[PDB]
Amino acid sequence: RNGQALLDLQNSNVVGGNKTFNDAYATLVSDVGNKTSTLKTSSTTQANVV
């Protein structure tokens, strides 16, 4: 039964209080994506300017 308890955690929203483990990892992924995209764009734009 405790083993079942451990398994149950896999669904639970513990980390963010509204976010589970997996969606928190997805949040990390989206954060890096956002930055890298915006910075690539801005880098090339300013590159054209110079």
């Binding site: 997805a26 989206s30 954060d31 994506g33 915006t38 054209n48």
Partner: protein
């Protein structure tokens, strides 16, 4: 066309459409505010050039 303000707005509203389909996605919400920041980046670079 890297300076194309349209391109940035189009990207932003791509984010918005994807979020509209899935209101839950943390990734799409976070990326939408990221694309807003890239949009204002385009704005600011154009404005500063002028």
């Amino acid at each position: 066309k890297s300076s194309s303000l349209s391109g940035s707005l189009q990207s932003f509203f791509t984010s918005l459409q994807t979020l509209v389909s899935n209101a839950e996605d943390p990734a799409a919400r976070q990326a939408l505010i990221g694309k807003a920041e890239g949009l204002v980046n385009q704005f600011k670079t154009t404005d500063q050039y002028l």
